[PDB]
Design an enzyme around this catalytic site. Sequence first.
Site, PDB file in Angstrom:
ATOM      1  N   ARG A   1      43.260  21.465 -46.567  1.00 28.78           N
ATOM      2  CA  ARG A   1      43.596  20.150 -46.055  1.00 28.78           C
ATOM      3  C   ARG A   1      42.385  19.290 -46.320  1.00 28.78           C
ATOM      4  O   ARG A   1      41.251  19.745 -46.181  1.00 28.78           O
ATOM      5  CB  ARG A   1      43.889  20.189 -44.555  1.00 28.78           C
TER       6      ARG A   1
ATOM      7  N   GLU B   1      54.955  45.723  -9.131  1.00 29.63           N
ATOM      8  CA  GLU B   1      56.165  45.417  -8.379  1.00 29.63           C
ATOM      9  C   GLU B   1      56.136  43.920  -8.076  1.00 29.63           C
ATOM     10  O   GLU B   1      55.103  43.262  -8.240  1.00 29.63           O
ATOM     11  CB  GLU B   1      56.201  46.206  -7.064  1.00 29.63           C
TER      12      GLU B   1
ATOM     13  N   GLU C   1      43.077  51.783 -20.314  1.00 32.36           N
ATOM     14  CA  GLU C   1      44.041  50.728 -20.554  1.00 32.36           C
ATOM     15  C   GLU C   1      43.253  49.510 -21.002  1.00 32.36           C
ATOM     16  O   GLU C   1      43.388  49.054 -22.133  1.00 32.36           O
ATOM     17  CB  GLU C   1      44.771  50.443 -19.237  1.00 32.36           C
TER      18      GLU C   1
ATOM     19  N   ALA D   1      55.116  52.223 -15.330  1.00 33.79           N
ATOM     20  CA  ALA D   1      55.494  51.347 -14.231  1.00 33.79           C
ATOM     21  C   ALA D   1      54.621  51.549 -13.000  1.00 33.79           C
ATOM     22  O   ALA D   1      54.518  52.658 -12.482  1.00 33.79           O
ATOM     23  CB  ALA D   1      56.955  51.575 -13.872  1.00 33.79           C
ATOM     24  N   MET D   2      53.969  50.485 -12.553  1.00 35.94           N
ATOM     25  CA  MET D   2      53.144  50.540 -11.357  1.00 35.94           C
ATOM     26  C   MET D   2      53.280  49.215 -10.606  1.00 35.94           C
ATOM     27  O   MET D   2      53.301  49.189  -9.372  1.00 35.94           O
ATOM     28  CB  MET D   2      51.686  50.836 -11.702  1.00 35.94           C
TER      29      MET D   2
END
EC number: 1.3.8.4
Lengths: 387, 387, 387, 387
Positions: free
Chosen positions: D275, D132, D249, D129-130
């Site tokens: 198809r 807000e 990250e 959590a960072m």
Amino acid sequence: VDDAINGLSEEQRQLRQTMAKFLQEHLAPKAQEIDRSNEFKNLREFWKQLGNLGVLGITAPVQYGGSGLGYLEHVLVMEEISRASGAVGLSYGAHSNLCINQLVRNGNEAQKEKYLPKLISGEYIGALAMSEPNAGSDVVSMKLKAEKKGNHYILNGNKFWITNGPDADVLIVYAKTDLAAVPASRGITAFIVEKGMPGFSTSKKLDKLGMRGSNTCELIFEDCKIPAANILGHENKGVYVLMSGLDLERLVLAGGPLGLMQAVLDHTIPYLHVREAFGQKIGHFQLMQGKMADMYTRLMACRQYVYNVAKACDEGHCTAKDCAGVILYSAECATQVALDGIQCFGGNGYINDFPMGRFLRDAKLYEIGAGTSEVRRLVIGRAFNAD
Amino acid sequence: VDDAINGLSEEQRQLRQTMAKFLQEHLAPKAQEIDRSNEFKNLREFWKQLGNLGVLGITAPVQYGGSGLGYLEHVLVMEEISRASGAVGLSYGAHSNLCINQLVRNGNEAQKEKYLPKLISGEYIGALAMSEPNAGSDVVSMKLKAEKKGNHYILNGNKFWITNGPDADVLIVYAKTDLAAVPASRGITAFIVEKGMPGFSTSKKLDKLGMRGSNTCELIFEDCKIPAANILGHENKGVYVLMSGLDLERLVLAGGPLGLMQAVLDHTIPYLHVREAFGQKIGHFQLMQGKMADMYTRLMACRQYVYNVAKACDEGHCTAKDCAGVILYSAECATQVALDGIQCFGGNGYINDFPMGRFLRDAKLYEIGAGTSEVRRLVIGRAFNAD
Amino acid sequence: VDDAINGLSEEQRQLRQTMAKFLQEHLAPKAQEIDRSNEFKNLREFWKQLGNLGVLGITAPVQYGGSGLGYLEHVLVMEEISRASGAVGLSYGAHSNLCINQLVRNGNEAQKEKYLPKLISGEYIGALAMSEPNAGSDVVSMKLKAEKKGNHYILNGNKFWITNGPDADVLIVYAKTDLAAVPASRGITAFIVEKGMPGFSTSKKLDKLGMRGSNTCELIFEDCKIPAANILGHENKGVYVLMSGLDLERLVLAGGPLGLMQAVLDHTIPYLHVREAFGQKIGHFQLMQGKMADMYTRLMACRQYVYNVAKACDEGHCTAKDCAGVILYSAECATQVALDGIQCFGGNGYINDFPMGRFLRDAKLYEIGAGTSEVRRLVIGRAFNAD
Amino acid sequence: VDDAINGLSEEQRQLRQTMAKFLQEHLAPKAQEIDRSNEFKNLREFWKQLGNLGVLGITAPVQYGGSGLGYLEHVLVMEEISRASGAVGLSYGAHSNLCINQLVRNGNEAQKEKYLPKLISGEYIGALAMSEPNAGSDVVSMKLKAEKKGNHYILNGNKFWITNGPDADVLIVYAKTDLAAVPASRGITAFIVEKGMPGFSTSKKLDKLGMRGSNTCELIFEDCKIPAANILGHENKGVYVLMSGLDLERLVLAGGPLGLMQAVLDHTIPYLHVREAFGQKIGHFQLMQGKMADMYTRLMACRQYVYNVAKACDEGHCTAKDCAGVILYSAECATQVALDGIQCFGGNGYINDFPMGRFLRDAKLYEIGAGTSEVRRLVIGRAFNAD
Ligand SMILES: Cc1cc2nc3c(=O)[nH]c(=O)nc-3n(C[C@H](O)[C@H](O)[C@H](O)COP(=O)(O)OP(=O)(O)OC[C@H]3O[C@@H](n4cnc5c(N)ncnc54)[C@H](O)[C@@H]3O)c2cc1C
Ligand SMILES: Cc1cc2nc3c(=O)[nH]c(=O)nc-3n(C[C@H](O)[C@H](O)[C@H](O)COP(=O)(O)OP(=O)(O)OC[C@H]3O[C@@H](n4cnc5c(N)ncnc54)[C@H](O)[C@@H]3O)c2cc1C
Ligand SMILES: Cc1cc2nc3c(=O)[nH]c(=O)nc-3n(C[C@H](O)[C@H](O)[C@H](O)COP(=O)(O)OP(=O)(O)OC[C@H]3O[C@@H](n4cnc5c(N)ncnc54)[C@H](O)[C@@H]3O)c2cc1C
Ligand SMILES: Cc1cc2nc3c(=O)[nH]c(=O)nc-3n(C[C@H](O)[C@H](O)[C@H](O)COP(=O)(O)OP(=O)(O)OC[C@H]3O[C@@H](n4cnc5c(N)ncnc54)[C@H](O)[C@@H]3O)c2cc1C
Ligand SMILES: CC(C)(COP(=O)(O)OP(=O)(O)OC[C@H]1O[C@@H](n2cnc3c(N)ncnc32)[C@H](O)[C@@H]1OP(=O)(O)O)[C@@H](O)C(=O)NCCC(=O)NCCSS
Ligand SMILES: CC(C)(COP(=O)(O)OP(=O)(O)OC[C@H]1O[C@@H](n2cnc3c(N)ncnc32)[C@H](O)[C@@H]1OP(=O)(O)O)[C@@H](O)C(=O)NCCC(=O)NCCSS
Ligand SMILES: CC(C)(COP(=O)(O)OP(=O)(O)OC[C@H]1O[C@@H](n2cnc3c(N)ncnc32)[C@H](O)[C@@H]1OP(=O)(O)O)[C@@H](O)C(=O)NCCC(=O)NCCSS
Ligand SMILES: CC(C)(COP(=O)(O)OP(=O)(O)OC[C@H]1O[C@@H](n2cnc3c(N)ncnc32)[C@H](O)[C@@H]1OP(=O)(O)O)[C@@H](O)C(=O)NCCC(=O)NCCSS
């Protein structure tokens, strides 16, 4: 073929017709040579013909021998000249709009009478100088000094990137009359300089990537004495004539990209249905059909975009974000389309014997001249910012 | 605010005003619910209000209670309904153009008198069926068989992807009357089917990505007996009514993308001037100002493009390439613009509590419905091929 | 600085280093002139230096004085030379890959010993001819006749768009030995022609948009008698050497767009941190920071893409779709990046005094040469078609 | 099948296979349901399985039962899980990287011994959590107050947009310890909160456009007493653990867009060859072959980009601009590729019965999460600004 689904009246259709046919025989065949030599040998001659057609003072009052028409017709002529030759279109754009239109708007009866007639006839060539070696996008940081000595102003400094620089007989120059103005914008004045004024000199033409044939050079002012009577509008209230003329510039100059995109189609479409590969016209392959579709829609969308904004302007409705908007969009489409034209020709589009490469080189200028794409996005975003 | 730089008359501006105000309180608030529930609970009621405003039979003769206006006015209304809700805009498009316009164009005095009035009032809901499970882009390969048994035809087969399918009281369906036609296109006939005809049934709504609330389902025909009197136009000369309707469909449905783009702007612009990061409104950062400029120019360009082509159509100047052009361009712009709208909202644009995600999901439809982008490029490319 | 995050070994980093330093003194300063004059005055001399460094026969067997390295090294060298000068990079590519590599692959011990040494040293210049005025993308439709008369073949016809055409002392020409071959691809043979062979002449170099300095001309064969011993590989089994060589061509030539994108960065990055507008380095404005980011990522992604594919090829894993994929992607990134470079320089990017415009005009060739972007898409799509 | 041209070692190829097979039967089939229901029913159970495979603490020290491998492997795993389910891929990403990796990097022997083992086994779910409600891109302006009361801190305020929020047994929260720090960045401390701590509560999951099934909620702290011993790293030196984590990250999360782009190809390629329209498989039309090429090269380029950067990072060479670069590029490619997937399916791609629309909805998150595309362009541009 030009589908006047554009919503042009008969007279405007006639205007485009007259131009196209004239340029078809007088400019179009010279275009390659102009670009290659980086010089338009018949420039003074051509301007006279242009004046005879009445396209030079197209938006200028009939009083001074102008045609008294609007920006929609101005973009039409711009687009058709740009279709025949990008360089000449640009030159025409500086003369007719940057110069002439600025004069009709801020010049007084005297200035108009004195200058307009010869500008409108093609006897004089015009140009507008505001850009400097260190003031392009940031035009307000111009450093050309204008000292007021009695009933004269002494200009010292230089201008850069001036189209029609070495040919202009009359020039609209912006200079800092009040270098210590609280807001720098309140220290600029516009002056009407003339060829031959002592102190005023010009440098050699530039070797550009495109627009070769449209003379661009540096302007040098050494103690150039300008009488106070040559001030366009009012002293220190020149940032205004500058800014207001910038919107009209972007509006009218959008005809450049339009003419260029048109020109690329004039070559690609017929070629695609002549060149054959794998047993059939290359234009019958999906990939190539898609190319046509894209080039065609971008040219059609931009045309309507510019035409409507111009019509609105003629009605009295003009806005900075909308003038910047039309050229921002058109400019970028022009480049991509020109890039596709070369692709459709294959090797042939990559040789200077074909004008495919010229359209690309010319097109790119419009994302820089009249304000770079970045400065235009700022103009639009800021408009919303102020709402 | 919508600048009618688009060149709209006073009346047309009036029309857009009337629609905007009405839609603002009667449809706009419901839009989120409509999408979420995948159902428009007041549809029938809404249609009668639309009919009262006179926008259902907008292009239909005043004789049958129609407004007797043109496609430009139709695009305006289509745009404004799509701005309020994409789902309802689509439904309105299927009704007022696919069905109604096709009736006024190919229906005889009897068919028009019998169907048009209830279609125009909103009492009836219309639909048009041509696409099948194995015939979307390749519409001509449709295999719904129509056996002629005396003064009747016996339809057997199915239709797929039909908007307003399970609501249509009257539907225009294309069937193969001559399954052995030399060129298959010579074996198709259009028939006016009605809700309740024995043999004719409909499947369950589809769970789509976007346009939720616009009911799409499968049509089932099992020994459905349709009187010869119900053929639209002429037997075997149906490919024609289909093709001709296709252009007007693309032209009028271009309003969808326009209303959608306008809807993202309606949300993005004010948000960018409210949400603040790093000490200022995010709309003051260059990257954001660039976003605004791009969404705004794409919207304006497409707006002028489609409006001018529509005006020309009302003058009697329509073309397949140009009708396919306007929607190909507008559809692709709408999606990207919608993508930016989410981007500008950050996390907030990624939650369903905000309509930014809806705009994206709805927008994408237009790149498939009314012909995929691929089919539209082929239309334009071939237009040039035949030149 | 080049972040060799690209996974290069010390030895390869050294090779790049060696190349960069050498080229920085010997080629880079003459690049602008080469382009402007459309000619490399030191060609022959330069080739001998290149051969001394061992980069000409970089992928050739040490047995003929070649370095005995792989394609990843060849890409490195091609990239570095292209970084210094696009035209010479292309000329280097034609020589080291199109000609030399094709000779090490399909030539017999005799041919390799008789030709490789001098091609590897720089004494000879090599070229590859397959394209004709009516056989570019459709290379199989080549019509250069090759009449077998005893132990000789009589070539008649011409070739077009041949790089290093008027300088090549050894050339690999594909001709139709069996013009009545059921599948036309079964009638092609590759022959090694040499400068001076009676019948074989060349034309004047082309005036191209970019790659000026890289000599491109037309090959002319008039009863040119080629001994049966000069056929590369086997008679009629030429379509094969042609096709196989085309993959490696696209792999290696990928270096061109890489070097060009690097060159753009080399100039744009520092310029953005020197030019100042509005009181700060233009590179501090978001729009400019975005530009850097995009140019940077595009170069970085293409680099890793081409390098990895080449590494795999050196491991014995090459595929037509992956060789075409590498250059399809890189070529298109190169052009857009090049377009951004000009933009970053403003008016300066638009004058020939700067090389920004050259990077653009050179980059575009890569979307044409080695097969157009269209032909490359077909190759990839077709691979999946066969999957 | 992924062409391991990616330069993966035998062991890494095995990891891919293991994951592919497992996920193929354990997660892939449930994907549609998860998204539809906005819930992963057997999350807890799945985590245990992932832990058993050893992919949860992939880059965690063997000491705590981790695999002790690097980011390249972690990108592989992330990619595969995202290929099976976007929502679960994200959840996995938040647990294995955001939470776990940060713990192994800044946690002391005690913290690692206490939390790592259960996080690595799957017994515990982790989150970071960072963000807000008024601190997303501008994360430094977070206002979660952490009052130091003796040996504890009293947290007051809330967090938002927290993935795995409602499920996390252990969470890494950043809170302002020094609200009056000169540079605000000097007033941040990271804490290790646990589920069940008095004062800490979570809100209801969010209704999102994509990633449905990956629980995102708001964190609420009301006098939540956290022992001084639970601070990650050091007091006020938290912006640092935050910023360092951000690069890793971005690097690892780049596997998401890779998996998503692979997912669309997994469906589009075979569908295009099944198809049929106009007599052949749709994938035999140039426009469709072009589509394959485009989505194929973009997937390949991004794959090599992120793989090489990951390899380098394992070698100890990471950079903010390169970690931001790979995700910036991959994220934008994933969205446009997903957009094309829908297109290739026609109407089928537009219904929720097919996953083509899910891919698009999921993809778009990556242009927002882990830092918006804008903030990523700033990171890269600024890096250049610094040198
Ligand atoms: C052929 C030609 C003809 C011209 N004719 C005329 C003429 O007749 N009269 C005349 O007065 N001038 C003329 N000019 C000049 C023209 O207006 C300028 O070149 C143009 O405004 C760009 O200025 P610059 O070259 O100083 O670029 P710069 O201002 O140096 O800008 C360089 C780059 O930085 C970007 N940049 C600058 N500020 C910002 C910002 N705030 N945010 C983001 N990016 C930014 C620019 O967009 C561009 O990408 C002409 C130029 C050319 C090349
Ligand atoms: C919400 C919705 C509402 C609709 N409403 C209606 C309606 O009211 N009435 C109605 O009759 N129909 C309606 N349709 C059907 C719609 O017209 C078709 O779905 C559309 O034309 C695409 O057909 P398809 O799904 O069969 O795709 P396919 O034809 O299977 O096409 C699939 C893919 O192959 C490509 N492709 C096909 N042929 C070619 C080619 N020659 N070259 C290159 N690419 C090609 C397509 O462009 C697409 O990318 C609607 C569909 C939807 C989803
Ligand atoms: C500077 C330069 C250097 C070269 N050097 C060499 C060299 O050393 N050796 C050599 O042998 N050749 C060389 N060439 C030739 C080059 O390979 C060809 O020019 C190129 O393959 C394109 O061929 P073309 O010009 O005949 O174009 P065309 O084949 O006429 O193609 C024209 C347009 O039609 C499109 N088109 C064609 N077929 C299809 C299709 N099936 N589907 C869709 N679109 C299609 C093309 O992509 C292009 O857009 C060079 C060319 C140049 C300009
Ligand atoms: C599904 C999902 C999962 C998430 N998971 C987590 C999680 O596990 N943990 C966590 O802590 N957070 C998480 N987040 C939060 C995520 O990090 C933020 O949503 C993201 O950084 C964007 O912030 P915001 O929504 O406040 O956007 P804002 O910061 O309001 O930005 C809105 C727009 O303004 C632009 N903008 C802002 N500043 C600038 C600038 N300086 N220049 C130019 N443009 C600018 C932004 O790019 C964007 O375009 C998640 C979000 C979502 C939607
Ligand atoms: C960057 C840009 C958009 C903004 O200028 P900036 O230096 O930020 O200044 P602004 O605040 O926009 O305006 C400065 C002054 O002009 C006034 N002004 C701005 N736009 C105006 C307009 N359209 N009409 C009238 N006045 C205007 C401002 O009101 C301000 O005057 P006051 O201080 O008296 O109020 C501007 O310098 C510009 O247009 N640059 C591009 C130059 C160009 O296009 N050159 C082409 C030459 S031919 S190739
Ligand atoms: C692909 C496309 C463009 C071309 O069709 P194709 O199958 O290649 O056949 P075409 O040669 O164009 O035309 C077939 C027949 O219709 C006729 N025709 C085509 N366009 C016509 C037009 N605009 N007006 C009249 N007749 C037309 C042709 O003349 C031919 O009839 P004849 O054989 O009697 O001459 C067409 O099938 C199409 O528009 N598909 C998209 C379907 C669509 O838009 N669906 C939307 C439903 S609502 S979401
Ligand atoms: C258009 C294109 C893709 C396809 O060629 P086309 O004429 O349709 O023929 P294809 O079926 O692809 O192949 C023809 C023959 O070569 C073979 N072949 C094709 N690709 C092959 C490959 N990669 N490796 C080996 N053999 C191959 C085919 O199998 C066939 O041989 P057989 O008939 O004995 O089986 C091809 O002509 C081409 O690459 N054109 C571009 C030319 C070019 O790049 N010139 C650059 C010169 S330097 S600027
Ligand atoms: C906008 C952005 C880029 C810049 O932050 P801003 O508020 O402008 O602050 P910066 O000056 O960049 O850095 C602030 C502090 O961290 C430090 N810092 C910045 N980048 C760093 C890095 N890569 N490594 C270490 N320290 C770093 C700075 O040096 C400064 O500390 P000091 O003041 O002690 O020197 C940053 O807030 C950010 O990355 N936001 C996006 C958040 C995000 O990605 N959330 C994802 C959650 S999961 S969806």
